[model samples]
Target chain A: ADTIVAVELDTYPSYPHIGIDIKSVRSKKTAKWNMQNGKVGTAHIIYNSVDKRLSAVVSYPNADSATVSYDVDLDNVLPEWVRVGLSASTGLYKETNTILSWSFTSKLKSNSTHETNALHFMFNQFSKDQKDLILQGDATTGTDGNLELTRVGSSVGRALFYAPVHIWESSAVVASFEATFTFLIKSPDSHPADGIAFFISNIDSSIPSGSTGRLLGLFP
Target chain B: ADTIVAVELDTYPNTPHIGIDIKSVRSKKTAKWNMQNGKVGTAHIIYNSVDKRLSAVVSYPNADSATVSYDVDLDNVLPEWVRVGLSASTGLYKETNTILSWSFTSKLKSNSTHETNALHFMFNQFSKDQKDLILQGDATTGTDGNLELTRVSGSSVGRALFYAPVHIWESSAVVASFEATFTFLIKSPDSHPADGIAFFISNIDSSIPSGSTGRLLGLFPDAN
Candidate 1:
């Protein structure tokens, strides 16, 4: 069975813009089909030895349709430099597209935090640490991979943080963004704990030093 | 806040084919620039209420190139009938494409199973006791929405059934067959279970009378 490995977007030619073209491995030749554009699309490439077919299907929205397809005659053997993503020949046209969410069945890297051209993800990084600080202040990690901000201490603590980089391009005034996350609220003891809030603030990244509890760290 | 719904393939015009064009409500006018070629690309549509700029970006496998686009102005109230899909005046080359998966956040329909041109579904329908026999085998529906093909109570019982009327076009081959997804969980009082499950598609409708326990899964009396 041919295994499909998720290649780093940067490993491909031109990163987000366009991908490399299919070429003969031994011959170092290319048809210059230029089928793949640099924009993001859910695509997969496969080589079946029993069937003796090498094919790739690049689809959008879903797998019900095949937007672009590539097939090769494997009468010989599997060729060289078989790669995914963009190529050096990828010309200028590129869009700054972001992958809102992506999940994999297997972990690709050992690091808890992974960076791609589209997103920077910190999955389950602090869940195991008791004192680890993602951005300091009231942020704390649990052994169960939970992030507890202001978990019931004697004094109220407030902390705030922002994404490493802004998600806006200069040309666009409003950058539409969507994210889905699951959260739970439980008291450290038997009593109920205060709730949490998710907000997009125009204020600075850090919360007010004295803000806590009912203020949700938003007010000074 | 305007909500974006990722419609499952069911409600859309055609599953693997082109879709309808975006249009105005009252006048129902369309520039009919059908740019979606059943291929992969990232596209966006935006309506600037302040500027009255009704524009869209139908980019290709890359953002730099646009296969099609439509822009308009709202001289009056931005009319009601704003839509998305393809049209007869689509006047562009269409590509036969694939979708890995598509999701929508809204409730387009009230039912758990959605119907589209592409698929026929019955998601957890048997959770109740209705005469809804899609194709009754030795199957029984549980109050918990489980479809128990072979119940544990009796020893020599086998079940085999299928959806009736053959819900597919005759011209299509197995290559063009549709897909249905459902959840299944097997359980028994003791640890080890007997002969497992089989998803079958045969010319025969129901299983043979004597073909319980193991043999004649509606076909031959025993495995060949």
Candidate 2:
């Protein structure tokens, strides 16, 4: 068996927004047409493991386009990213959609304070059209990677400072950019992800402001 | 000392959006300067009363122009219509701003699960815009007169419904047409505001939703 892990966890302070935790799954042998490859066929995908944090499956149906689509129902969870690996149960193996990249951001809470949260992820230097989209609600974990948001004040967890994600846009090589944020949290706790902010700055991510907690980190 | 009392409110929900509440003590000397005037240079309003939801002022010294203005500090709140009322002071004689007739509508909250504490005041809408200036962040309260944001689901204070006021237009005489609407978000047991919608159609301005909530009775997108 060959090991195929796509995403790796590196730190505790790291927040993930996308994961393959299955809410429901059904399996059966079926035929699929590969539009990219221009071929038609039958294949099998077997469920190997299922749990609250993640899900695992194996078969010849890993990344290929199929006619019989398997509906993978998912419930919302804290982990923003998921890893999909493939290995041979019988012989050598290849994959169709094995390339999994993480997007959406998870907003984590560590301490309390207002200024720290409001200023965190503050993407102040962007264009008008860029700000409008992020403020209007469009960016999500699946499309643009998880972008975290938060507001300031000691009552941070009261759900008082979460930026509602508006939209997305990208600059050329001058800068690689993504993510925008807005706030709709009346009180932090009602959804207390410490509220969040849309970030688009160039501050050095080394000097964490201990007073504002990890949110107002050295470069937050 | 003749009697006069002016009150104001601050509606800037976020920062950098400043609202100045102007309250006056209604003296014969101050009344003329405060009422029926355009922009006074001498008396710059300098007090803001938000909790009482009013602006209180002692009237300042004189200057060249009547500095009062009616423009709201709508930084990012634009591209949307927010209902505003021109309320007046209570007295043996009510000296209110001269507004001939104006109206507005605002977006509704996206859900019935959230409370939206919004207020709009009505005013004398016939005043000359060039002469009689209506300053921003000015107000007074009355029992029957309030600016009704005549959009659907506007009165849903604490709900899952969400709406964004589209346009703010006013008319002296009744226009041949008008519309109102509100927005809403579908929440889950887990939590998240799902997709929402907007509505546009003809309706009476004063009835405050004579129909059910989120009911677009006859708003047909494919109508001729």
Candidate 3:
């Protein structure tokens, strides 16, 4: 069919699959290929065949609208035309019948790269693995879904989120990027250990061993 | 000659002249243009022919090096090749003879209609008529060369520097512009004063020539 209205499938794939993908048609007649991803949670993939742009949106509970989105310019890396398709795969447990709805639009929309764009999660609407961003240390999701970086304790706990990609580059020249987030620090008594700091470094992403408490786990 | 050396001229023009200019070799052909004004005190104009950038440096009596500079791009308005010249002008009176030097370099180098780039002078190194920018009200240059908008007095004095070539557009859906920022320090003998400052833009050009004593900042008649 020229257009994919909806698709419902049960069970899991023979091989492990984590997300859904939509590919292009016309493999023999027209050598063209385009694809889009339908990631976890309430996610949907919209493809504009004309512009050859794949837009993915994932909505989370108790999260802001348009939680996370990416406009992948397929034509920038792909040929003029290509076939497309829709497929999905989940890990060990495959939930019951799944419902997927998709459509095609002629018009295309994109967000400005110069503008401030962010994905904020109030509770636990976002997964730690989303966007290849990892959360470690005392970081844990509260039953209410808050991504707690540290809890009230004296053992010196620390949590970190390592981005999968370089959000900012400084090799060639000076670059500019801004990130601001609200954090809370609470204690049973009036005394508190060490304060917190936002670090920007070009060093490795892994946490150094033997680093704790006042050290802030930032240095080796 | 393909390269523009330098030219020196005596006497000022009909009105007044202050800065220098480097013209191209060919009378009609202009390579590029870049200029910075180092007005007041000893200033030098460095024209990098290779990059076609004119940079000016103004040295204040008590200021540090590189106090003020302007980088003009002539390529945007001039041809690929042209001759250059150096000239200067002042007000009704001329100061002591000024010395100007020129050089050439082979170093190859290098927004909007309403948002015409502006030369913002913080302490009045510029005049009210510089770059079509007009100053109104009690705005005057202090002994320290400061562009004082208002003075400590019982009278109401409002001074403004009008940027020529209006930028706001009526036909366009939305108009975007930019403005540099500076701080305003309000102080009194002990406490603050009863007056404040404001940055405003309006349709009319003339200031409230007759309004007085904070009549909606001259936008309206006295609150009589």
How high is the CA lDDT of each candidate model? 0.26, 0.19, 0.27
Tell me the DockQ of each model, to 2 decimals. Answer: 0.02, 0.01, 0.01
lDDT of 3 by residue, A1-220 (tens): 1111111111122221112122211111111111112222233333322222233233323332121112333334333222221222222221111112222212211111112222222222434343323443444443233344444232223333333213222111111121222223333332223323233232234334644443343333
Candidate numbers sorted by lDDT from highest down: 3, 1, 2
Candidate 3 per-residue C-alpha lDDT over B105-174 given as tens digits, one digit per residue, 9 for 90 to 100: 2111111111112222222243434443444555444324334444433444444444442332222211
Top candidate on lDDT is 3
Candidate 1: list runs displaced more than 4 Å: A1-117, A120-125, A128-133, A153-163, A172-174, A188-193, A201-204, B1-42, B45-224
Predicted complex 1: CAPRI docking category = incorrect
Name the top DockQ candidate: 1
Q: Encode model 1's per-residue lDDT on B74-160: one tens digit a residue.
A: 323222211111101110112111211111111111111111123333433454453434434345555355455543343323332
Better of 1 and 3 by lDDT: 3
Fnat of every candidate, listed in order: 0.00, 0.00, 0.00
Better of 1 and 2 by TM-score: 1
Query: lDDT (0-100) at residue A118 of candidate 1?
Result: 35
Q: Is candidate 2 or candidate 3 better by TM-score?
A: 3
In model 1, how large is the Cα lDDT of residue A211? 42
